Amino acid sequence: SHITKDMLPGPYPKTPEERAAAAKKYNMRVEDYEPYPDDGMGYGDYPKLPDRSQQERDPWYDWDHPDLRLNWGEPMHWDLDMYIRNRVDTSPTPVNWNLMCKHLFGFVAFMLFMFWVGETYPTYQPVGPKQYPYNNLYLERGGDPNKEPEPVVHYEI
Amino acid sequence: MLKYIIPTMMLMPLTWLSKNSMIWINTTLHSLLISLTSLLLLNQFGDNSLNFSLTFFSDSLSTPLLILTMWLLPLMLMASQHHLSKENLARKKLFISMLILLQLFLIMTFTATELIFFYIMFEATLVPTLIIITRWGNQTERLNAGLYFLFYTLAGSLPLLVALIYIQNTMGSLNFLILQYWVQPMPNSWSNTFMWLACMMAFMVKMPLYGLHLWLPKAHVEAPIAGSMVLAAILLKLGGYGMMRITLLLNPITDFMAYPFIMLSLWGMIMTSSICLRQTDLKSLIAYSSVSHMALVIVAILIQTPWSYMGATALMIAHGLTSSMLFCLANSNYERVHSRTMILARGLQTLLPLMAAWWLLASLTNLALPPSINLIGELFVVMSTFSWSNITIILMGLNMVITALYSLYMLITTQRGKHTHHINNILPSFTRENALMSLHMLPLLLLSLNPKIILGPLY
Amino acid sequence: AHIEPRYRQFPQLTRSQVIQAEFFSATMWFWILWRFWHDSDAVLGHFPYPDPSQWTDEELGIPP
Amino acid sequence: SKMELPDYKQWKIEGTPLETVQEKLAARGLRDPWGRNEAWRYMGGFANNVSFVGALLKGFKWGFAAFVVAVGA
Amino acid sequence: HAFFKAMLFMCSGSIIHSLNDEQDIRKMGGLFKAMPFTTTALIIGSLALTGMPFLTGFYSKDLIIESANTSYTNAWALLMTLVATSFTAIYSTRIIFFALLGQPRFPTLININENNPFLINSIKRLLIGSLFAGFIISNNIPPMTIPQMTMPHYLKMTALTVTIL
Amino acid sequence: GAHLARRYLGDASVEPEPLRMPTFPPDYGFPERKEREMVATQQEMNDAQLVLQQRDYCAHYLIRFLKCKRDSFPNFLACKHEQHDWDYCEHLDYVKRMKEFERERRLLQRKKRREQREA
Amino acid sequence: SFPKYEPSRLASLPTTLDPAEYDISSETRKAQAERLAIRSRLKREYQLQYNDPSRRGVVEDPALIRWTCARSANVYPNFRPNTKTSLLGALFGIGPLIFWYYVFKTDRDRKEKLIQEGKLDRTFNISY
Amino acid sequence: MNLFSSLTLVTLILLTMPIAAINFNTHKFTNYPLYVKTTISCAFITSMIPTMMFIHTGQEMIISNWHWLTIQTLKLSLSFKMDFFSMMFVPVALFVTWSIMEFSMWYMHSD
Amino acid sequence: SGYTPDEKLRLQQLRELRRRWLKDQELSPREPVLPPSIFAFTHVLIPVWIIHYYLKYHVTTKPYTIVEKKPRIFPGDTILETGEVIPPMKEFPDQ
Amino acid sequence: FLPSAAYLTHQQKVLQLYKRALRHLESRCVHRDKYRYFACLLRARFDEHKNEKDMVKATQLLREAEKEFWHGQHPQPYIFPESPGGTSYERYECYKVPEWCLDDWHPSEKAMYPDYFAKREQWKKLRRESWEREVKQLQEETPVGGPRTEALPPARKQGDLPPLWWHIVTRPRERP
Amino acid sequence: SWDKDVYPEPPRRTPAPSPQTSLPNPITYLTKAFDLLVDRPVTLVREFIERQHAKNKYYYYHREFRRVPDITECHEKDVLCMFEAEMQWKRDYKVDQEIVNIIQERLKACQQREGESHRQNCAKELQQFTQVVKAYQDRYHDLGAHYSARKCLAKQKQRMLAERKATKEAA
Amino acid sequence: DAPPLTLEGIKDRVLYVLKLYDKIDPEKLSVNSHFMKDLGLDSLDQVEIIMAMEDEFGFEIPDIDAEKLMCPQEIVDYIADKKDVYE
C-alpha cells in the first residue's frame, strides 16, 4: 500500500514543476537535485551523488544505521550496490593515484626485465657431467632390454 | 508404472472429500506412501531399458527424475502453507488438487515412451502452473509474469509438434526404441537445419537459453513457493530431459549448427554470473543462478560425450535439490520481514541461530563443495568440454570463480554482520521450516555417499 | 594466592616462571654450544676446498 | 579492590630523556612540556632495561658451566 | 617451519592478549623482565630464524641456499634470496628491538599474566619441539638426493655472514 | 663466482660452457689411464632398490651406509664413518668434474693460442 | 610542496583541502542550515514511528522501496533507443561473442586438420 | 603387514569421533576441550609409532577400498597412501595442533 | 563550547536511568538458573579392533587392495624366507 | 555536519587539525621522548601566530597548514584498538543481541529466570504506562514546524522521564 | 582368496634384521604386544561368525549366456534380430570396460611393488597395457555417445577400407 | 579481561592524572571545576588534556565530544558511558 505519485516516471522536464515535485519527493536540496541529464539510459529522474560515500561519513557522527552509513531518508545512491563497505572502500588515498599506478607498473617491469636478464645469463659452477655407468644409464631410461646398445664409454682424468 | 499412476489420480479426490483441518495430514501421508512406492521401481538392470506395454519405459535418464518429483511432492505441499493458510477451504482444496494434477502430468511426461505424447504432456505441464502463479502471484505484475511464461513456452514449443509429425510420417511410429533402431543419418541440407533448429529452439526456450532468459526472473519473483520449486526444478530439468531424448536422432548436422548455441550459452553464462552479483531482490539471484547452471547443462548436452551425459544428469539432480532448498529459505526470510529486498534483512547470526547453518550448507552445495554431487556434475562437464575444445576451460573456471563468489556473497550479505535494530518481528525458527531443511539436505548427502544411481545411461 | 594488577609499577613475578625462562634460554645456549663443538664444525664443511683443479699441467695429454 | 594510588609529586623527576628534553628545550626557551607524566615509564625496575647483546644473549650466564661439564664428559 | 611459526604465533598472540588485545608495535615497547618466559620464547624463535649456527632452524634453510648456489641457477634469483635473507634478519631484529629492548610504553593498570598451566605447558612443549625434534627429523632421513658437500670459500659461510651484517 | 664473471667478461670461445660438455673429443692424448672403477654391482644395485641419479660412482659406500643404518636403527647417532666415506668419495668425484672443466678450459685456451700463432 | 591530491574515480577528495570552500558564502551557510533542518525532521519522523512500544512491524522505509523500484523494474519505461545506447549495446553484445566464435572456428579447424593428418598425441586418448 | 596399515587407519579414524559425538550427545561436554585434547594426544601417540617402523624398515604402503562408480576405463575409491611424506608429515601437524589446542583453551576462555 | 543546562539535565536523567537499568542487569539471587580414564582407553581400543576386523577380512578377500613398496634387500645379507647369501660387495680399497 | 549546528567553526577545524597532527606525530615519532620534544615544537608552531586577531589571515594560514599536514601524514597510524578503523571495531559484536528480544522465550526458560523477568515486566509496564501523556504532549507542543536540531530537551516541565529514553538508555552492555 | 590366474603376484622376498645393538629391540616388543592384544579376539570373532553361518548355506552363481549369431546376419529392418545383436554387443562392451579396468589395476600394482625401479620389470605390463589400449582406441573410441551397434560396424568398414586402400597404394 | 572498576576509583584516577599536569595548580583542582569558565586554562591545552586521558584509557573520545565537557564530572560521565561502569 503506497501512493503511485511517489514513484518516478519521466525525466527532469519541466524545470519549474517537475523539479519542484521531485525535490519534494526525494527530500534533497532543491537546485542541487540532479538529473543525470536525460541520457536515455533508463535512469528516470533519480539523483547523482559524490560517489564515494562510505569511508567518508566518519562513525562518530552517530546516525541511525550501523554499517550502511544511512539514516532512513537519504537519496539511497544509485550505485550504492558497488559502494558498500566490505565491497569498495573509497578512502582518501594516502599518497596519490598516478604516483601509485606508475611506481607499481614500473617496478613490475623492472623486475621482469631483470628476470629476462636472469633467463639469458645463467650461473653455473666449474662442473662437467656425471659419470653414469651403462652408457649414460641405459635400462633406466626407456628400455629396449635386448635391442639397442650404443657404445660410448667414460674416460678418467 | 500404472500401479504408480492410479494412486496419483486417486490421491486427488480424498482431498476433496476430507473433513476440515484434516486435508493436510492425509495429503502428506499418502504422498510419502507413493514416494516409497515408486522408489521400489529401481531395478534398471544392465543392458536394456525396462519397458511396459506401449506407454511406459525407464532408462536411468528418467528414474531419478521420477523419484525426485515424488520426493518433491511433500516438500512442495509442506512449503505451500502459511501464506494461503487463512484463505478459503474450497480454494485451498482447489490449490492442493491443482498441484496433484500437475504432478500427474509430470509423471506422464517423464515416462513418455512416445514423443507426440511427450509434446502433449509437455504443455500439460505448462498449463496448471499458469493458474497457480496467476491466482496467488503475491505481487503486482503476476499478470506480466504468467503472460511471458505462457507465450514463451508455447511459441517456442509449438513447431516441435510439426517437426515430430514430419518425423512420424517419414520413419513410422515415434517409439524411443524404434528411433534407437530405425535411425539413419540426415545430412547437411537446409531442411535438416530447420528441423534441428525448430526442435532445439523449442528446448532452448525451455531451459532457458541466455538469448531468452528474461523469461525466468519474472516467473520466479512473482510465483508462490510451490510453483517456484516445481517451475525451477521439474520444468527446467524436464526440458533438459527432453533434449536428452531427442538428440539421439540428428547426428551429423549438430556438428555444423551446434556452434552458435554453445557460444551463446558460454558467454551468457558468464554474463549471468555477472548479473547475479550486483542486483538487489534476494529471490531473483537464485533465478539467475539457475540460468547459469542450465547454460552449463546446455553445453553438456550438445557436446555429445558419455562423460558429458553422466555429469549432465548429475548436475540436473543436484541443482534441482539445491535450488529448491534455497527458494525455501528465501520463503522463510520473506515470512520474517515481508520485504523481498536484500539490504533490509541483515545480521541474523544470533537471531535464528541455526537457520544460518542451513544457509551455509545450501551456499556450500551451490559452491561446488567437492564431495557434493554439484561438483561431480561440473567437473565432468569440464572434462568433456576440455576434450571438446581444449581452450574453453577459461570460461569454465571463470564461471566457477564467479559462481562461488556470488553464492558466498548472497550468503554473507543477508545473514552476516549486524541486526538493523528496528525489526521487532523475527521469530525463532519454526519446526516446519527446519523440517523442510532436513527434507532437503539429508537425502542429498545420502545420495552423495552412493551416487552410482544417478549417473546417465552411458554409465 | 591470586594475581593482582598494579598502577604504574613494575609488575610482580613468581620465581617459577622466571626460573623456567632462564632454564630454557640456558638450555638453548647449551644446545648451541654442545652442538657447536661436540661433533661439528659443520659450518666449515669437513673438506678442504680443492684449488683450480691441480695448478699442474700433465693432465691426460695436454698440448705442449 | 585496593589500589593505594601511588601518589603524585613522588617521582622527583631527574630522569635521563626527560632531563635532556627539558634542558634542550629550556635552551630553546619554552620550558612547557606536558611534564612528568612518564617517570614511571622511564624508571623504577626500568631505567637500564637490558641493551642489545644482553637481550639476545641472556642465556650464557649459566650455560657456560654446563658446557664445562660437557667438556668434562 | 611448522614447529617454528606455530611456536612463534602462539608466543606472539599470548603477548597480545597479555596486553589487552592491542597488538600494535606502537605503545608496546618494553616487555622484557615482564615475565620473561614468553619473551624468551620470542627471542629463541627469532634467533632460530636466520639459522644461528647451528640449530633446528639452521639445517633446511642453509642446505637450500647451498644447493641453490651449487646449481645451474639464475644470476638473479640467488641474489634476491640473499638480499631477502638479510631482510628477514633485519625485521627479526626489529620485532625483538620493538618488542622488548626499548623503554616501556603501554597504558597503565597492567594485568600481565602467565598463571596458567596450559600456556606454560604449550610454550614449553613447542620450544622443546624446536630445540630437539627438528634435529631428530632432519637427521634420520634416507637421502633420496645427492648433497653437494663440497663448497668454495664464501659459498657455505656466506648466508650466515649476510645475516650477521 | 669467479669463473662465471671471467666467462661473461671474456669472449665466448676461450671460456667454454656446460650443457655442451663434449667439446674436445675423448681419448685426445690419453696415456691409457682409464680404469672406471665400477664397484656398483649394478644388478645387485637394482636389487637393493636405489634411486635414479644415485646409480652413480661411489655408490657402494652408500650401500654400506644404508646397511649399517638398517642394522642399528635406534642407534640414532651411529653411522657417520661410512657416511663420511661416501661424502669423501663424492668429494673425489667433484674434484674429477672440476678437473674435466678446467682441462677443457686450458685445452681451448692453448688451442686458440696455437691457431693464432700458426695463423 | 605537494602534487595537491589529484582527483580520480577513486580519489576521495577529503573534507579538509578542497580548497574551494574556504570563502564560505552566507547563503551557502543558509543551505547547510536547510540540510540540517531536513535531516532533523526526517529523524524526528523516524523516532516517532520508531519508539512506539506496541508497533510490532518494521520501520517501513519508503526511501529504500523507492530506490528498489527505481532500480529493478522502472528502467524500460522510460527508454528511447539512442545512438549511445545502440553503440554500447553493440559493443557489449556482438564483439566478445563473435571474437570467441572466431577462436573456436580456428581451434576446430586446427584440431580436425591435425587429427585428419594423424601426427597428434592420441597414443591413448581414451576418455573422449 | 597388518600393523602399519591399522595404525595409519586409526590415526585417521580417531579424529572423526568427537564431531559425531556432539551431534549425538544432546548434553554439554563442558570439558569438550579436554576431550579434544585427549583424542589428539591418542592420535599423536599412535602416529609417532608407524613413522618409526617406516624408517626402521622402508615398507611403504597404499590402501584402497570402498569404491564408487567404476564407470569407464577408470575407477575411484577412497584410496590413500602412507609413504615418506605421508608419514613424516602427520605427527608434525598433530603435535603443532595439540599445542594450539592448549593455546586455544587459554585464548578462548571467556567466549 | 559547552552544554546547555537542559542538555546537562537530560544527561543526568540518562545517568539515573542507566544506573537503574544496569543495576537491574546485576543479578545473583542465589538461584539464578534452576534445574527444571578407563572410558578413555576403551575409546582408544574399540575402533582399533573394529577397523582391524575390517582390515584383515574384507580388505584381504578383495585381491587388489592394500599393497606395498617392498622391503629392501641387501647384497651381503640373508633372506628370512628362502635363506641364502647374495654375493656381497666388491673390493674395498683406496679408503 | 554535526548534531548542534551546521557551520563547524574556525576554531573547531583548527582544533581537529591539532588532534590529527599530534596523533600522526605519535605514530611517526616512537620512543615517546623525541615525540614529547616535537609535541612542544608543534604547540610552539601554533603559538607562532596565536596572536592573530584577523580572520582571513587565520584561515589562509590554516589552509597552508592543511597542505603541510597532508604533506607529511602517515600510512597506518596508531589508531586505537577500540576506534573505528582500529583493531577491535565491534570485535565484541559476537553477543550484542538487541534488547527488544527475549519476549519470545519458551515459558520453561521464563520459569528459569523468575525475578529478572518480573523486573523486565514492570520495566515494560513503566514504558507503556509513561508513553501517552507526557511524551505525546511534549511531542505535540515542543516540536516547532522545523525542528532544526538533532537534540531534544528533557522533561524538565514537572515530573517523569524525558522522552525517547528507550532505545537510547536500553542499549546492550558492549560486553559479553 | 582370489584367482591368481587373473591376479599374478611376484614371489615374496623378505630380508632379516641383524642387531648389533643392545637397546634391546623396542619395535619387536610393541609388535608382539599388538599381535597378542588385538589379533586373538578378532580371530575368535572370525571363528564365531564362521560357525554361525556354517549352520546353513546359500549359493550365488555366475550368469552365463548363449550366443545369438550376428548383426550382419540380420537384414535392414529385423527388429527381432537387431535387438539380440545389440544386447549381446553392449554386454561385450561392458565386460571390455572391466578388462581395461583390470589391466589398469595391474599397472598400478606394478608401479607400487617396484618402488623406484620404474624402468625394470614394468616393461611387460605397461607394454601389454599400451597394446590393449591401442586396440581400444582403435575400436571403441571414435564413436561418440548414442552408440547403437551400427555405428561401430560403420566405423569398422571405414577403418578397414581406408587401411586397405592405403596399404594397397603403398604395397 | 574484566578488571574491577568503580566510579570513585576512576574519579580519583582522572583527578590524579590531572594533578600531575604542569600548568594547572595542584591547589585549585576540583571535581566540579570548569576548565573554560573559572580555571582560566586554555582550550588548546584542554585538548592536550583530552589527548592524554584518551591515551590512558585506551579509546578515542570523538571530536564532537572534544568540545563540550570542560569539567571532570562530565568526563567521568562520558568515560562511564563508553566503558559502561555501573553495578
Place of cell 594423424: G118
- In the beta sheet, which residues pair with residue H61? H82, I68
Chain E residues with CB under 8 Å of J30 CB are 26, 29, 98, 102
Contacts (Cβ under 8 Å, ≥6 apart) of B143: B134, B137
Show the CA angle centred on residue B42, arms to residues B37 and B48, nearest 5°: 140
- What gap in Å lies between CA F9 and CA F13, rounded to an integer? 12
In degrees, rounded to 5, the angle at the alpha carbon of residue J116 between the alpha carbons of residues J112 and J119 is: 140
Q: In 10 A of CB B36, how many CB atoms?
A: 9
Asked whether F39 and I90 are in contact (CB, 8 A), the reply is: yes
**How much is the CA Rg of chain L, to the nearest whole Å?**
13
Tell the burial category of B290 from Cβ atoms under 10 Å away from its Cβ (0-12, 13-18, 19+).
buried
Task: List % helix, strand, coil for chain F (3-state, nearest 5).
Answer: 55, 0, 45
- Give which of D4, D21, D38, D49 to mutate to test E binding, by max E Cβ within 10 Å: D49
Would you say B55 and B23 are in contact if contact means Cβ atoms under 8 Å apart? Answer: no
Strand partners, B52: B56
Q: What single-letter amino acid sits at E69? A: N
Neighboring chain L residues of E109 at a CB cutoff of 8 Å: 3
Resolution (A): 4.3
Residue J113's contacts (CB-CB under 8 Å, 6 or more residues apart) are: I32, I33
Cell of F94: 667433484
Listing DSSP states for B92-126 in one string gives HHHHHHHHHHHHHHHHHHHT-SBSHHHHHHHHHHH
The half-sphere exposure of L46 on its side-chain side, counting CA atoms within 13 A, is 23
I62 CA: distance to closest CA in chain K (Å):
8
Residue of J nearest to B429 (CA): J104
Please report which residue ranges of F48-80 form alpha helices under DSSP H: 59-71
L12 flagged as catalytic: no
Question: Peptide bond preceding A16: is omega within 30 degrees of 0, i.e. cis?
Answer: no
Residue ranges of alpha helices (H) inside B366-422 are 373-389, 393-414
**C-alpha angle with apex B337: B335 to B339, nearest 5 degrees?**
100
- C-alpha–C-alpha distance, residues H6 and H8, integer Å: 6
Distance CA E83, CA E88 (A): 9
Where do we find the cell 570460461?
B395
Please enumerate in sequence order all residues whose Cβ is within 8 A of that of B148, keeping only pairs 6 or more positions apart, or say none.
Answer: B214, B215, B218, B219
- What is the distance between the alpha carbons of residues J79 and J98, in angstroms, rounded to a whole number? 28
What count of other Cβ atoms lies within 10 Å of the Cβ of residue G123? 9
CA angle F86, F89, F95 (to 5 degrees): 145
Pairing of strands H60-65, B56-58: unpaired
Burial F69-103 (b: 16+ CB within 10 A, else e): bbbbbeeeebbeebbbbbbbbbbebbbbbbbbbbb
With b for 16 or more beta-carbon neighbours within 10 A and e for fewer, the B211-242 pattern comes to ebbebbbbbbbbbbbbbbbbbbbbbbbbbbbb
Domain boundary assignment for chain B: 1-459
In terms of Cβ atoms closer than 10 Å to its own Cβ (0-12, 13-18, 19+), residue E91 is: exposed
Sheet arrangement for strand H78-82: H78-82, H60-65, I67-69
CB contact under 8 A, H60 and K27: no
As a dihedral over the C-alpha atoms of residue J40, residue J41, residue J45, residue J50, rounded to 10 degrees, the angle is 20
DSSP string, E33-91: TSSHHHHHHHHHHHHHTTT-TTSHHHHHHHHHHHHHHSSS--SSHHHHHHHHHHHHHHH
Phi-psi region of C3 (alpha: psi -120 to 50; beta: other; left: phi over 0): beta
Closest of L71, J150, J5, L63 to residue I2, by C-alpha = L71
Buried b (16+ CB within 10 A) or exposed e, G73-109: ebeeebeeeeeeeeeeeeeeeeeebeebbeebeeeee
Using alpha carbons only, give the angle E69, E72, E78 rounded to the nearest 5 degrees: 40
Question: Are K100 and H73 in contact (CB < 8 Å)?
Answer: yes
In 3-state terms, chain J is what percent helix, strand and coil (to 5)?
45, 0, 55
Instruction: For residue G78, give the chain A residue with the closest CA.
Output: A42
Question: Which H or E element spans position B255?
Answer: helix B253-257
Touch test H–K: 3 Cβ pairs or more under 8 Å: yes
Neighbour subunits, K (≥3 Cβ pairs < 8 A)? A, B, F, G, H, I
Cα distances from F58 to residues A71, A133, E149, F93, J100, in angstroms, run 81, 11, 14, 8, 82
591547589: which residue's cell?
A: L27
Of C12, E24, H109, the closest CA to residue L58 belongs to: E24
Residues 50-109 of K with CB under 8 A from B: 77, 79, 82-83, 87, 90-91, 94
- C-alpha cell recorded at residue B233: 526444478
B211 contacts: CB under 8 Å, gap ≥ 6: B204, B264, B268
The secondary structure of chain K, three-state, reads CCCCCCCCCCCCCCECCCCCCCCCCHHHHHHHHHHHHHHHHHHHHHHHHHHHHHCCCCCCCCCCCCCCCCCCCCCCCCHHHHHHHHHHHHHHHHHHHHHHHHHHHHHHHHHHHHCCCCCCCCHHHHHHHHHHHHHHHHHCCCCCCCCCCHHHHHHHHHHHHHHHHHHHHCC
Distance in Å, alpha carbon of I42 to nearest chain J alpha carbon: 38
**Of A72, A70, A30, the residue nearest A47 (C-alpha):** A30
Alpha carbons E68 and B93: distance in angstroms, whole number: 80
Distance CA F109, CA F10 (A): 12
How far is H56 from chain F, CA to nearest CA, in Å?
6
CA distances from K125 to I63, K111, K128 (A): 18, 10, 5
Closest among E43, D54, E115, H107 to C16, alpha carbons compared: E115
Cis amide bond preceding E54, omega within 30: yes
A-chain residues near C60 (CB < 8 A): 155-157
Whether residues J68 and G1 touch (CB distance < 8 A) is answered with: yes
Look at L2 and J174 and tell me if their CB atoms are within 8 Å: no
Judged by DSSP in three states, E130 sits in helix
Asked if B421 lies within 8 A of A66 by C-beta distance, the reply is yes
**Distance of alpha carbon K83 from alpha carbon K75, whole angstroms:** 12
Helix axes B142-157, B116-135, angle to 10 degrees: 170
Q: What secondary structure does DSSP assign to B153-191, as a single string? A: HHHHHSHHHHHHHHHHHHHS--BHHHHHHS-----SSSH
In whole angstroms, give the CA distance from residue L71 to residue L32: 6
Cell of E91: 625485521
* B371: helix, strand or coil: coil
Instruction: Show the domains of chain L with their CATH numbers.
Output: 9-83 (1.10.1200.10)
- Taking every pair of Cα atoms in chain A, the longest distance, rounded to a whole number of angstroms, is 103
Tell how strand H78-82 and strand H60-65 pair up. antiparallel
Q: What is the 3-state secondary structure (H, E, C) of A44-93?
A: CCCCCCCCCCCCCCCCCCCCCCCCCCCCCCCCCCCCHHHHCCCCCCCCCC
Q: What CA–CA distances, in Å, run from B290 to B156, B343, F55, F103?
A: 20, 22, 59, 72
Please give, rounded to a whole number of angstroms, the shortest distance from the CA of L38 to a CA of chain E.
30
* CB L10, CB L57: distance < 8 Å: no
Substitution target from J4, J99, J116 for chain I, most I beta carbons within 10 A: J116
Cα E139 to Cα E62, E63, E159, F76, F81, distances in angstroms: 15, 13, 22, 8, 15
> What letter represents residue D8's amino acid?
Y
Note whether I77 contacts K: Cβ–Cβ < 8 A: yes
Say what angle helices L72-83 and I5-25 make with each other, to 10 degrees: 40
Instruction: For residue E144, give the nearest of F51, F76, F94 by CB distance.
Output: F51
Q: Is E110 helix (H, G, I), strand (E, B) or coil?
A: strand
Helix (H/G/I), strand (E/B), else coil: G111: helix
CA distances from K96 to B361, K101, K103 (A): 41, 9, 11
What is the C-alpha to C-alpha distance for residues E95 and E39, in angstroms, rounded to an integer?
A: 11
Rounded CA separation F24/F33 (Å): 17
Among E69, E74, E146, most A C-beta atoms within 10 A, so best to mutate, is E74
Q: How far apart are CA E60 and CA E58, in angstroms?
A: 6
The answer to whether the CB of F59 falls within 8 A of the CB of K8 is no
Give the cell for residue A14.
519541466
Residue A55 contacts residue A90 (beta carbons within 8 Å): yes
Experimental method of this PDB entry:
cryo-EM
Secondary structure (H, E, C), H31-62: CHHHHHHHHHHHHHHHHHHHHHHHHHHCCEEE
Beta carbons of B201 and B258 less than 8 angstroms apart: no
Chain K interface, mutation test: which of A137, A140, A148, most K Cβ atoms within 10 Å? A140
B373 dihedral zone (left: phi>0; alpha: psi -120 to 50; beta): alpha
**Residue L62 DSSP one-character state:** P
What are the strands, taking DSSP E only, across chain H? 60-65, 78-82
Cell of residue I70, nine digits: 617392498
- Please name the residues in contact with J165: beta carbons below 8 A apart, sequence gap of 6 or more: I13, I14, I17
Phi-psi region of B279 (alpha: psi -120 to 50; beta: other; left: phi over 0): beta
Q: Residue for cell digits 531534544?
A: J152
Dig out the grid coordinates for H50 from the structure.
Answer: 608407524
Closest residue in G to H72 (Cα–Cα)? G127
Residues of F with CB under 8 A from a CB of H: 49, 73
Which one of L12, L25, L38, L42 is the catalytic residue? L42
φ, ψ at E110 (rounded to 5°): -90, 150
B307 contacts in chain H (CB < 8 Å) = 72
Which residues of chain H make contact with I69, given a CB cutoff of 8 A? 58-61, 83
**Residue B390: burial class (beta carbons within 10 Å; 0-12, 13-18, 19+):** exposed
Residue D1 touches partner E, C-beta closer than 8 Å? no
DSSP-based three-state secondary structure for H78: strand
- First-to-last alpha carbon distance for chain E, in angstroms, is 23
Cβ neighbors of L25 (< 8 A, separation 6 or more) are none
Distance CA B415, CA B332 (A): 13
C-alpha cell at B266: 558460454
8 A C-beta contact, residue B318 and residue B374: yes
What is the Cα–Cα distance from G10 to E125, expressed in whole angstroms?
Answer: 50
Minimal-distance CA residue of chain K relative to B309 = K145
| Residue L9 burial class via C-beta count within 10 angstroms: exposed 0-12, middle 13-18, buried 19 and up | middle
Partner E contacted by F66 (CB < 8 A): yes
Return the half-sphere exposure (C-beta side, CA atoms, 13 A cut-off) of residue L36. Answer: 11
Q: Grid cell 556432539 — which residue?
A: H22
Going by C-alpha positions, the residue among B342, B408, B148, B267 that lies closest to residue G72 is B342
Cβ J94 vs Cβ J176: under 8 Å: yes
| Pairwise CB contact (< 8 Å): A122 & E75 | yes
